[PDB]
Write a protein that binds this ligand. Structure first.
Ligand SMILES: Nc1ncnc2c1ncn2[C@@H]1O[C@H](COP(=O)(O)OP(=O)(O)OP(=O)(O)O)[C@@H](O)[C@H]1O
Ligand SMILES: Nc1ncnc2c1ncn2[C@@H]1O[C@H](COP(=O)(O)OP(=O)(O)OP(=O)(O)O)[C@@H](O)[C@H]1O
Ligand SMILES: Nc1ncnc2c1ncn2[C@@H]1O[C@H](COP(=O)(O)OP(=O)(O)O)[C@@H](O)[C@H]1O
Lengths: 601, 590, 222
DNA sequence: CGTTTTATTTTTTTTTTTAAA
């Protein structure tokens, strides 16, 4: 009904009259800048958004089908060359075909792209470009996709054009050529990859958020086919939001399994959005301790545990001597059953700590948290399909009540104590998998709540092999204190009468600001001046004497010294001064001492 | 356009459009300003037969063709009154409102719009199908069109085939989408309601866009439909029934703003505790006052841009043999709240490695049994005996109330707000403090605040209570009977109790539920002083005067329970406020 | 056409049909089609059992004996009509077969109209054959343990059900309670004290019940 | 210048895995 032509005039006016002076800084040509970026042979994809055309008019806020507009604008600016020879493979290869002498898509050279979920996705959504957020599933890989090949006749010579949109196809035969027409001189048909056009191609399933799905519902997935430039633009288990099109899928073939008008739909892509800049404001603030003041406000007091965590948040200790690496990840252990809200801090960290994970005391047996295997006589063979502990690299996978899972379960996790090494002689390998995950252990005491008669490993039943792999072991008990629980109570009830706990003692730090300030930290690689080396080796001995002077005491591993070394240089990442010094390790030992000497007194 | 009655038949529905029923009641400002846009009008056959009984038969022998017709008259009516609800030119199907067993559809009722009741089951995949073809001629640029059809809509099909191209001359020919519309299609089957059965025989149905899965496999319904069968037996035959509306019977409410006005006015009677505690189980001394919250679920709490705290309560207590004929009066009445077998699994929350069902299957039978009680409640027996494997799988819940397992199946997280109860048996009988409270049962005390109480249930047969037991328990046993059928009404001692037979009643009770389960009674200025002062003194003075005897679970995580008890009380009177005397209801547990 | 809805399993038939076919031929050479159809079956009326599916002189038989108030203890030598046992205590059956009364209430509960009774002892007492007769003397099944007890066609999963099948008005009397697997010993606790029935293999919940009961037989300890 | 296209299900033995007083 509407004209698909006079709109071409409208958009010519739009892009031509485009230096839109709404602010100091727009009299220059915006899409002229992008135009010349095409003339730079650089940009192969431009972009449309609601604001852009919204100011222009109000038709096309509901006209744009999303399909005809694209081919029209593409051909429109393809024939727009207001503007150098050897820039591309194919681009110069046409000149090679012209050295002795098309649709503008075959010289593609560029592209353009432009508050609901699958559940709400009402089935009158065809063609409309809509918005949904999900979770990625079943990570796959990318291959080339033809669009239009060049089936030359050789004897005749006529590089045939087979521009295709389908996903299945059929060959082109000997010759639809002019000289290979009724004029008897002809050869045969045969493509030339070099002059052919293909396109990247990434696909993966999309599962539901799991926060919307009603009481009587089961999450389901859709399919994602993103081709061309945008490939490799999301990993598995990223909570991502996509604007694209719903489009049906003409699954042609058999004439009785189809022929229902089957309509097994699918989706077309534009983008994978997943829900220094700070430097001037980072200049506004210079403090070390306020992180604890604004990280996890939900409980008053017990800062020491939190700062112990924030160190693991800090990081920044690693070296590769002798060819071999060193574990630069901290792994805390946790015993206790008070009301701590380990579940609290776990949820807090797992939210703010990007690339987080969670498992429970029996939810993942030894094969699930790591890679595993499967069985099916319908899809082919089976793979490892690693688990949370496999996936949580550059981060932490947080087990809750590792004490209660199982004794043999300590094995495979103990294997990852020596980091980045997940050996598997199961699928005919000694595979590695790079287990590069910081580890969070939290459990409860044994029968009772730290019965003072039943001593350590008298009350506990854990082999030394795992405690040795753990930098810090922490028992948490707070006996009846008349004054203690008061403050904690009124503190809790504050966000019950209210929504935001801590007033007027610090500036709260949002997830964004917190993460960004932490983002500026770890790349210092600071200086530990040489006097420490003689000094610290002395101080370590101070431990090893008061370890031996009582005979019913803890054993020690070389990691005790390696740990007390490992922690200090990390914290200088958040000092941001490349200056590992006395305080850098005096806090290390201080917190180590606080880890102990707490259960007798 | 068959035998030319078709238009006259259209007129007869258009002739539905003249006076007080049409002119006052029916449509126009009966749907359109209430703004649903859903084509489907309710028909009521007794009126149409009161006008055109011949046309009340016009369906009941040939309902193949009343449909384009009905839609035509409707678009004429709605299309010649409202220009807004008119840019949806399609069929715009309607109501069409003999119930026979799915076992008694016997060659016949072909052409008839008739009823069967049964089970929703095998609720299945959803996939749209295609109506028209908005084809374009991009050289000549004419948006031409090609409609389609199926037997599942009418009798005929077009040359149902590939979306065409290169049809006229070989010009620029291509589709246009976003306009070539589509139709949401669903498939499922129904069974007879099993109690009648002496293999009970099923039926198969097919749906459309506004008819799409109004309930779930595990529900049951009355459903009305026509009949066909397309295939050509021996040049076999197999049928399906269709052309449908929807209804449903197993729900619960003539409740406009009158019934809310009913529920408010009786509020102020202060000790409803009396009434609502003596309400469901007068067939039982004893608790019912205490039961309150296992029905109410709990309360919701969210921190800005943070996390939350789970809200609902879980308690159970007793001498052997009231405990199996007790966990009731809500299992029946409470909305969709399910206790379980007592010693059950393959369905608490596990996969149960058994791949002998469909030869594949990753999640093919991964699920539990409390998510069917999401925002409900549960009870069971035999906990005193049950396995310790999924005790693990409890400790996640009572702490969190979200299930998060990933033994390679999948890395789960799924809402649940649920509560649940337990069993008991004293492994040695009548010992509660002479020996001790704990471990006359064979039990564990790690679950301190997991459940929200340490409580007790006791008995001894006596000499002094001997005739008390006799005369009361038999007072029950003959106030069991009428005039105190096979059993008329038992009045006295509910009429000496100056009561009335529609004030002790279920719909009269849940009169005060649906709305009471909707409020947000925030805290004021009294918990803050009360709770910390008192739990501080309690966790120390529960340690003297022989009450260290029964002081097993003292925690400060209990402090949520101390609130969500009274939270129910704040919606027991629907006051968005709270008192010190509201406190006493959430201390008197002690 | 009309000869369905006529016949169910466990019956005895005479028939006339046709020997006819469905396949075609010339299967290493030609193996083919058996079946028959119906024309006009004639079924049996086997004697005295089938007051089951398809007088007042007998009421006069009934009542003039109950006119005598001598049934309570008279039929204490009838339930074992030909052999010895339970003699002075067989009077306690008078309550159970008639049962009590499933006296519903205005309140929640549906009382235990179903009520249960016991036997236990050694073999040799005719305890095998006595209850053997009791199936002959309303409706039930009778053996003990693992022996009732927890298709390749048209892709529908059949499930023939549980234990209220022949016992919902019918009641039973069986041995070997502990002489039985403990997987199928939860159900008894659900069956019996309440008929607290449910289903969980697939995702739907049979809310079944019954007016049924049991007796127990025994060869347990001492 | 005419006359024709197209479907498969259950059981084994290994290597995985999983159960009760
Ligand atoms: N001082 C406090 N700060 C913040 N929250 C608190 C405090 N004291 C109590 N709470 C609340 O009490 C609840 C106690 O239950 P919680 O989730 O702590 O179990 P848990 O202590 O993690 O159990 P376990 O330690 O046995 O795993 C917590 O959710 C927490 O929010
Ligand atoms: N105070 C009471 N109120 C109502 N009923 C009672 C009361 N006291 C006793 N009864 C009756 O006594 C019976 C006791 O047997 P019951 O069915 O409770 O066994 P049970 O407690 O379930 O056994 P177990 O707990 O060992 O499985 C109940 O059926 C109940 O009706
Ligand atoms: N008082 C009795 N009257 C008749 N038969 C009896 C009597 N006592 C024992 N019997 C015999 O006992 C046999 C049944 O024994 P049974 O109850 O099967 O032993 P068990 O219970 O060990 O299997 C019958 O065949 C019957 O002949």
């Amino acid at each position: 009904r509407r004209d698909y032509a006079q709109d071409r005039e409208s958009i010519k006016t739009f892009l031509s009259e485009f230096c839109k002076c709404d602010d100091d800084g727009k009299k220059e040509f915006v899409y002229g800048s992008q135009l010349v970026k095409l003339a730079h042979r650089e940009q192969v994809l431009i972009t449309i958004d609601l604001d852009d055309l919204a100011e222009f008019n109000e038709s096309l806020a509901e006209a744009v089908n999303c399909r005809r507009y694209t081919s029209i604008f593409s051909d429109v600016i393809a024939e727009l060359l207001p503007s150098v020879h050897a820039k591309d493979a194919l681009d110069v290869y046409i000149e090679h075909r012209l050295m002795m002498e098309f649709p503008s898509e075959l010289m593609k050279r560029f592209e353009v792209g432009f508050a609901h979920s699958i559940r709400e996705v009402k089935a009158q959504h065809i063609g409309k470009l809509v918005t949904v957020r999900g979770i990625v599933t079943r990570c796959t890989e990318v291959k080339p996709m033809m669009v239009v090949a060049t089936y030359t006749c050789d004897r005749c010579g006529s590089e045939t054009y087979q521009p295709v949109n389908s996903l299945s196809f059929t060959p082109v035969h000997d010759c639809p050529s002019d000289d290979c027409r009724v004029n008897k001189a002809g050869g045969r048909l045969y493509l030339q990859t070099r002059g052919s056009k293909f396109v990247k191609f990434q696909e993966v399933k999309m599962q539901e958020h799991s926060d919307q799905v009603p009481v009587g519902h089961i999450p389901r997935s859709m399919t994602i086919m993103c081709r061309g430039e945008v490939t490799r633009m999301a990993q598995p288990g990223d909570h991502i939001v996509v604007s694209g099109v719903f489009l049906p899928l003409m699954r042609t073939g058999f004439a009785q399994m189809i022929q229902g008008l089957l309509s097994e739909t699918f989706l077309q892509a534009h983008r994978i959005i997943c829900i220094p800049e700070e430097l001037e404001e980072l200049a506004q603030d210079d403090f070390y301790e306020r992180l604890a003041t604004s990280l996890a406000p939900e409980i008053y007091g017990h800062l020491d545990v939190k700062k112990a965590l924030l160190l693991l948040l800090v990081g920044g200790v690693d070296k590769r001597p002798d060819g071999m690496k060193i574990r630069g990840n901290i792994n805390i252990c946790l015993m206790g059953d008070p009301g701590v809200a380990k579940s609290q801090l776990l949820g807090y960290i797992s939210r703010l700590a990007v690339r987080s994970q969670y498992t429970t005391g029996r939810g993942s047996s030894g094969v699930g948290l790591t890679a595993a295997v499967m069985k099916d006589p319908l899809t082919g063979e089976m793979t490892l399909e690693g688990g949370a502990l496999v996936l949580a690299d550059q981060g932490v996978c947080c087990i809750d009540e590792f004490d209660k899972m199982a004794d043999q379960d300590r094995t495979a996790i103990h294997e990852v104590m020596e980091q980045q090494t997940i050996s598997i002689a199961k699928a005919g390998i000694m595979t590695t998998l790079n287990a590069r995950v910081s580890i969070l252990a939290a459990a409860n005491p044994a029968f009772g709540r730290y019965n003072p008669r039943r001593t350590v490993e008298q009350n506990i039943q854990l082999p030394a092999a795992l405690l040795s792999r753990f930098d810090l072991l922490w028992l948490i008990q707070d006996k009846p204190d008349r004054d203690n629980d008061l403050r904690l109570a009124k503190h809790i009830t504050y966000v019950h009468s209210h929504s935001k706990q801590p007033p007027t003692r610090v500036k709260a730090l949002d997830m964004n600001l917190m993460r960004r300030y932490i983002n500026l930290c770890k790349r210092k690689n600071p200086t530990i001046p040489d006097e420490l080396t003689d000094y610290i080796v002395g101080a370590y001995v101070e431990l090893r004497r008061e370890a031996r002077n009582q005979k019913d005491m803890t054993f020690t591993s070389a990691r005790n010294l390696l740990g007390i070394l490992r922690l200090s240089t990390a914290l200088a990442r958040l000092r941001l001064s490349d200056s590992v010094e006395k305080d850098d390790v005096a806090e290390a030992l201080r917190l180590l001492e606080m880890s102990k000497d707490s259960l007798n007194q | 356009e068959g035998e030319q009655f078709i238009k006259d038949i259209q007129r007869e529905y258009v002739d539905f459009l003249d006076d007080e029923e049409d002119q006052g009641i029916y449509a126009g400002h009966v749907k359109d300003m209430i703004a649903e846009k859903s084509k489907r009008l309710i028909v009521n056959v007794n009126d149409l037969k009161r006008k055109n009984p011949q046309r009340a038969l016009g369906l009941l022998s040939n309902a193949a063709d009343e449909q384009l017709a009905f839609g035509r008259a409707l678009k004429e009516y709605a299309s010649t009154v409202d220009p807004g609800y008119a840019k949806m030119h399609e069929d715009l199907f309607v109501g069409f409102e003999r119930h026979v067993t799915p076992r008694s559809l016997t060659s016949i009722y072909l052409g008839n719009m008739v009823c069967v009741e049964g089970i929703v089951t095998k609720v299945s995949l959803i996939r749209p199908k295609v109506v028209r073809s908005v084809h374009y001629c991009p050289n000549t640029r004419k948006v031409m069109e090609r409609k389609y059809t199926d037997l599942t809509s009418f009798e005929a099909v077009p040359s149902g085939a590939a979306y065409p191209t290169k049809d006229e001359d070989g010009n620029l020919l291509e589709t246009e989408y976003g306009l070539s519309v589509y139709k949401d299609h669903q498939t499922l089957t129904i069974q007879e309601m099993p109690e009648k059965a002496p293999l009970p025989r099923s039926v198969d149905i097919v749906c459309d866009d506004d008819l799409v899965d109004r309930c779930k496999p595990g529900d049951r319904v009355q459903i009305v439909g026509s009949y066909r069968c397309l295939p050509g037996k021996r040049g076999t035959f197999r049928t399906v029934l269709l052309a449908n509306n929807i209804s449903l019977l197993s729900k619960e409410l003539d409740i406009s703003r009158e019934d809310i006005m009913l529920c408010k006015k009786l509020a102020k009677n202060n000790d409803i505790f009396e009434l609502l505690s003596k309400s469901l189980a007068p067939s039982i001394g004893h608790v019912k006052q205490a039961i309150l919250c296992l029905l109410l679920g709990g309360v919701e709490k969210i921190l800005p841009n943070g996390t939350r705290l789970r809200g609902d309560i879980n308690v159970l207590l007793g001498d052997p043999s009231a405990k199996s004929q007790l966990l009731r009066y809500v299992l029946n009445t409470a909305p969709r709240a399910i206790p379980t077998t007592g010693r059950g699994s393959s369905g608490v929350g596990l996969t149960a490695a058994v791949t002998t069902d469909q030869e594949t299957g990753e999640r093919r039978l991964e699920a539990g049994a409390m998510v069917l009680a999401d925002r409900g409640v549960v009870c069971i027996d035999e906990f005193d005996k049950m396995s310790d494997i999924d005790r693990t799988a409890i400790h996640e819940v009572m702490e969190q109330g979200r299930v998060t397992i990933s033994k390679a199946g999948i890395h789960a997280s799924l809402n649940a707000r649920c509560s649940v109860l337990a069993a008991a048996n004293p492994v040695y009988g009548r010992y509660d403090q002479y020996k001790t409270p704990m471990e006359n049962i064979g039990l564990q005390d790690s679950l301190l605040s997991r459940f929200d109480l340490l409580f007790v249930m006791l008995d001894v047969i006596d000499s002094d209570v001997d005739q008390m037991i006799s005369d009361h328990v038999v007072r029950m046993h003959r106030y069991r009977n009428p005039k105190e059928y096979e059993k008329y009404d038992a009045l006295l001692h509910g009429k000496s109790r100056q009561r009335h037979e529609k004030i002790l009643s279920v719909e009269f009770m849940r009169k005060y539920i649906h709305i009471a389960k909707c409020m947000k009674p925030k805290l004021g200025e009294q918990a803050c002083e009360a709770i910390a002062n008192e739990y501080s003194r309690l966790r120390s003075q529960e340690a003297v005067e022989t009450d260290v005897a029964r002081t097993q679970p003292i925690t400060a995580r209990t402090l949520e329970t101390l609130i969500r008890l009274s939270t129910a009380h704040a919606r027991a009177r629907m006051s968005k406020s709270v008192t010190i005397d509201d406190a006493h209801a959430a201390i008197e547990l002690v | 056409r009309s000869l369905c809805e006529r016949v169910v399993p466990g019956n005895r038939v005479l028939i006339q049909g046709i020997y006819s076919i469905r396949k075609v031929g010339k299967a290493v050479v030609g193996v083919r089609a058996p079946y028959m159809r119906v024309v006009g079956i004639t079924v049996d009326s086997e004697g005295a059992g089938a007051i089951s599916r398809y007088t007042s002189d007998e009421e006069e038989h009934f009542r003039r004996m109950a006119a005598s108030g001598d049934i309570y203890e008279r039929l204490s030598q009838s339930l074992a009509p030909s052999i010895f046992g339970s003699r002075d205590i067989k009077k306690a059956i008078t309550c159970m077969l008639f049962g009590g009364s499933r006296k519903r209430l205005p309140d929640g509960l549906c009382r235990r109209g179903d009520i249960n009774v016991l036997l236990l002892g050694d073999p040799g007492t005719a305890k095998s054959q006595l209850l053997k007769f009791v199936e002959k003397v309303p409706i039930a099944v009778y053996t003990s343990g693992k022996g009732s007890s927890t298709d390749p066609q048209t892709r529908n999963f059949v499930m023939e059900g549980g234990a209220m099948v022949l016992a919902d008005g019918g009641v039973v009397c069986i041995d070997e309670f502990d002489k039985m697997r403990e997987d199928d010993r939860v159900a008894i606790h659900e069956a019996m004290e309440q008929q607290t029935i449910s289903i969980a293999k697939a995702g739907i919940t049979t809310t079944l019940n019954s007016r049924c009961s049991v007796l127990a037989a025994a060869n347990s300890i001492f």
